[PDB]
Amino acid sequence: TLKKMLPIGLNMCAPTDQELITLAKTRYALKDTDEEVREFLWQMALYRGLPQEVSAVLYHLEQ
């Protein structure tokens, strides 16, 4: 519906966690519960210049 705020959420996570984001995206592909997934466990230069839950959103929007 209204996903103009997705970049704001994406800005919260550092690029290093990118490899995590896809991995959990597979767990929601198996219809796993949120609690289990929580239990189941130059870009940097620009990120450092400034003073999980997202993967569910991308997985849901992938449909």
Partner: protein, 789 residues
């Protein structure tokens, strides 16, 4: 060419060079240290404008001296020559600039520059409407009188406001004027002049196409006059009383007529003054008859234009008071990335900044883009235009909104979804349908490259993102979506190519839409031939325009000048060539001859008077001339010289054959037509290269044929082009010999570094200064047969 001077040497420090130009009888002369040089240029073309120029390489320092307060001359100019500083236009200021640049240095980086508008020598001749025969209609005679009366009242009021008072003899110090009287009390000749001027305002309105006619018959008796206080009264009892026109409002069409009326008056005045021998000059000289305002109205200063417009506007309000009603080819430049940088996958982003608002275009292009087609007019590019929000790919569509100075456009391409997106100042541009993407469903093909196009007088800046911190709106839109700068992780700046508008000769493509070239073998009675034909002469989409064709290989003259029987033909050194024009093609539209390696004129109105030519004359100290040489780059003859007298057009269906003969040992070139001699001949210097060439304008299905034949005791052309065939009298056409045609534009590579040149005003006495210090070098590849680098 060498010249004689007292104490000859190459230019050295403390030398002074003086240049003199005489437009009358084209003449250019030089003096060094006050001693004249014994050589002159003359008899050159006169179209266009002339300017001084100095050319140099690294490691020089010079100063320009132009006279006046821009550098004092070290020697007295010849008696009739004027200083250059007098030639500055009223709207401009003196400065130093380069010639036809396409790049500039800026604060945040280099700027790209489009073509520059320039004046022409026909912009200095005034052309009035010439409405002499025009005669004011009878129904406008009353208003002519009333108009003159009010113009007088207004004039008198202005004088009186500025302290003028009546006296019988004009005195400009005491501000006494005899015309400060009632209109009816002026001397008859002055009244008549005023009536003539009023009538010519009316006649000029009519010549400009105005409809002038009575509309409100009540308006006149409702007019009132301005009532001035007694302090505006002259000693003779006269007090001006101009009409109160405060209620009158010019319509837009009437304002435009005021504006148009003025220019015509200034132009006719300027033409009248020029007819008596006056001229323009930045400084006034009454005895020399030079005035600082003798230019056409377009080039005048704003203050003078407004001052001239004021009186005409006043007259227009007065007239409306009485109830009357009155009712490619260097036009664009294209820059693009190099072919090696084409991308076939990923998501990419770059930025473009518009320094000026105008006709500019930006987007993505295919590697095989053409230089002579407008950007986006075909299927090879996807482009956004900001002057008027539009998107271009195989057509024009409305899109986005217009930009302003300093705006930044971000271009993004996605090759996973095959989409193209444009953003303006971080805001995504969308069409009327509300779609976010500008283009979709794009086939990858070979890849895409950044491309931009600039019109006349425009300036722009391009950023491919070598430094991420330099981008301004990348983080706002594009960073989180997964887009990357185009030039990231690159050690050196990206190489750029641009469109160069210099005509060059190129081979005819094997699949050209309109033209076809055929090779014909030699029979028992015919020589080998190269024939040209038109493919679509009669169709609706036919293309008809001038054609400049030449052969591929040249002939060269020697270093020194000093039924066939073999004894004559083995040492003849004379060569022959032929051209056949078929019946149906008008012989009045064909020029035949030779060209030099440096012909670059793509002219659509070609004529034998357009050929560049010059004469260099050498003389002695006592005034005796030693030699005079003529230089040109085209030696041709016109077909119309060989048409039959009184011929009724192309009614006669007969072919025409023109032959050319050259002597490589004496430098003499001659022509024959239908076996008859011609009076034209040419003489050239040793060590010269020549190419056979034909200029044509098609008028029939079959146009022309090159014939490599042979005459008695004269060798064919093949014996002059190829070394192994130097003694073979049998004509032949090897595969290396082919026909070429002239092309207007091409591609060129931009250098990586440029010379640094500094200019400044050295001083009021010293003049202007130019200086260059840092050397630069390049590696050049040379093609010998075309004499090119």
């Amino acid at each position: 060419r060498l010249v004689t001077s007292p104490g000859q040497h190459l230019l050295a420090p403390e030398d002074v060079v003086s240049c003199c130009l005489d437009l009358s009888v084209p003449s250019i002369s030089f003096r060094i240290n006050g001693c004249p040089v014994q050589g002159v240029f003359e008899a050159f073309n006169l179209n266009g404008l002339f300017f001084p120029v100095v050319s140099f390489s690294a490691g020089v320092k010079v100063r320009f001296l132009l006279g006046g307060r821009h550098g004092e001359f070290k020697f007295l100019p010849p008696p009739g020559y004027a200083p250059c500083h007098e030639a500055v236009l009223p709207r401009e200021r003196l400065r130093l600039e380069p010639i036809k640049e396409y790049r500039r240095e800026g604060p945040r980086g280099p700027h790209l520059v489009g073509p520059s508008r320039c004046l022409s020598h026909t912009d200095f001749v005034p052309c009035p409407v010439d409405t002499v025969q025009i005669v004011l209609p009878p129904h406008l005679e009353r208003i002519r009188e009333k108009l003159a009366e009010n113009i007088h009242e207004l004039w008198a009021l202005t004088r009186i406001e500025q302290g003028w008072t009546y006296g019988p003899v004009r005195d400009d110090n005491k501000r006494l004027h005899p015309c400060l009287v009632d209109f009816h009390s002026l001397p008859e000749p002055e009244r008549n002049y005023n009536l003539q001027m009023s009538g010519e305002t009316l006649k000029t309105l009519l010549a400009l196409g105005c409809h002038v006619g009575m509309a409100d018959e009540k308006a006149e008796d409702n007019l009132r006059k301005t009532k001035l206080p007694k302090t505006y009264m002259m000693s003779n009892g006269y007090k001006p009383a101009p009409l109160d026109l405060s209620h009158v409002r010019l319509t837009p069409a009437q304002t435009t007529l005021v504006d148009r009326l003025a220019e015509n008056g200034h132009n006719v005045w300027a033409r009248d003054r020029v007819a008596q021998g006056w001229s323009y000059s930045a400084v006034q000289d009454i005895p020399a008859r030079r005035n600082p305002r003798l230019v056409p109205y377009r080039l005048l200063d704003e203050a003078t234009k407004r001052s001239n417009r004021d009186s005409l506007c006043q007259a227009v309000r007065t007239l409306l008071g009485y109830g009357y009603n009155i009712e490619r080819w260097d036009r664009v430049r294209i820059f693009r990335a190099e072919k090696s940088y084409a991308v076939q996958s990923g998501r990419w982003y770059f930025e473009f900044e518009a320094v000026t608002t105008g006709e500019m275009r930006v987007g993505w292009a295919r590697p095989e883009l053409r230089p002579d087609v407008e950007l986006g007019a075909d299927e090879l590019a996807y482009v956004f235009n900001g002057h008027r929000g539009q998107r271009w790919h195989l057509g024009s569509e409305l899109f986005g909104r217009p930009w302003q100075s300093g705006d930044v456009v971000g271009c993004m391409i996605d090759l996973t979804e095959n989409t193209i997106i444009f953003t303006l100042n971080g805001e995504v541009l969308m069409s009327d349908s509300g779609s976010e993407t500008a283009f979709r469903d794009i086939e990858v093909g070979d890849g895409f490259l950044p491309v931009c196009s600039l019109g006349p007088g425009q300036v722009g800046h391009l950023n491919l993102g070598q430094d991420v911190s330099s981008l301004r709106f990348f983080a706002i839109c594009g960073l989180q979506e997964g887009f990357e700068p185009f030039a990231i992780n690159m050690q050196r700046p990206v190489t750029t190519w641009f469109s160069k508008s210099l005509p060059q000769f190129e081979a005819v493509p094997l699949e050209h839409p309109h033209y076809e070239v055929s090779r014909v073998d030699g029979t028992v009675d015919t020589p080998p031939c190269l024939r040209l034909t038109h493919r679509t002469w009669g169709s609706q989409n036919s293309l008809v325009e001038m054609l400049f064709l030449r052969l591929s290989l040249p002939v060269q003259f020697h270093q020194h000048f000093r039924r066939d029987d073999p004894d004559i033909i083995l040492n003849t050194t004379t060569y022959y060539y032929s051209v056949r024009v078929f019946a149906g093609q008008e012989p009045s539209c064909v020029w035949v001859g030779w060209v030099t390696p440096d012909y670059h004129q793509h002219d659509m109105n070609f004529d034998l008077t357009k050929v560049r030519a010059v004469t260099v004359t050498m003389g002695d100290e006592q005034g005796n001339i030693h030699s005079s040489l003529k230089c040109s780059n085209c030696y041709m003859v016109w077909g119309g010289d060989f048409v039959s007298p009184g011929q009724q057009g192309r009614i006669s269906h007969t072919d025409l054959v023109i032959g050319c003969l050259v002597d490589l040992a004496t430098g003499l070139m001659t022509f024959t037509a239908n076996g008859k001699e011609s009076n034209t001949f040419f003489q050239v210097e040793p060590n010269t290269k020549l190419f056979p060439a034909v200029f044509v304008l098609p008028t029939h299905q079959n146009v022309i044929q090159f014939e490599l034949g042979k005459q008695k005791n004269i060798m064919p052309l093949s014996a002059a082009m190829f070394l192994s065939e130097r003694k073979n009298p049998a004509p032949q056409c090897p595969p290396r010999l082919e026909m070429q045609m002239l092309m207007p534009v091409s591609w060129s590579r931009m250098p990586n570094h440029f010379l640094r040149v500094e200019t400044r005003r050295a001083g009021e006495r010293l003049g202007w200064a130019v200086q260059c210090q840092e050397p630069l070098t390049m590696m050049a590849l040379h093609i010998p047969e075309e004499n090119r680098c």
